[PDB]
Amino acid sequence: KREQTIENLYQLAQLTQQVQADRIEIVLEERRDEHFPPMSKALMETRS
DNA sequence: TTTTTTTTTTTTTTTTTTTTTTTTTTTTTTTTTTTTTTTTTTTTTTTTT
Numbered sequence: 001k002r003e004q005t006i007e008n009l010y011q012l013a014q015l016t017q018q019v020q021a022d023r024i025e026i027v028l029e030e031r032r033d034e035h036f037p038p039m040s041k042a043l044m045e046t047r048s
Numbered sequence: 049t050t051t052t053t054t055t056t057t058t059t060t061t062t063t064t065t066t067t068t069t070t071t072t073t074t075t076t077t078t079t080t081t082t083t084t085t086t087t088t089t090t091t092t093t094t095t096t097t
Contacts (some may be wrong), residue, residue, distance in 0.1 A: 040064060
């Protein structure tokens with residue numbers, strides 16, 4: 001009588017792999033299109 | 049006697065770091081109002097003269 005239980009767990013898993021893909025899309029929107037902010041030639045003297 | 053190119057003066061503009069002030073939010077704070085236990089007052093009955 002675990003039919004309900006397991007199929008319902010798969011139904012959460014099925015609607016939630018959608019959430020995983022949604023997070024991946026959130027990344028794609030958030031993917032940088034940019035790099036690490038550069039140095040100012042004085043932070044060069046400071047840290048380098 | 050003339051011309052060309054480069055190394056020095058100075059001048060202009062931008063970014064990063066570090067200057068101040070105000071507002072919003074959070075913390076300590078007595079007055080007023082509300083809640084509970086209580087010592088004084090009121091009522092009735094029984095017994096005795």
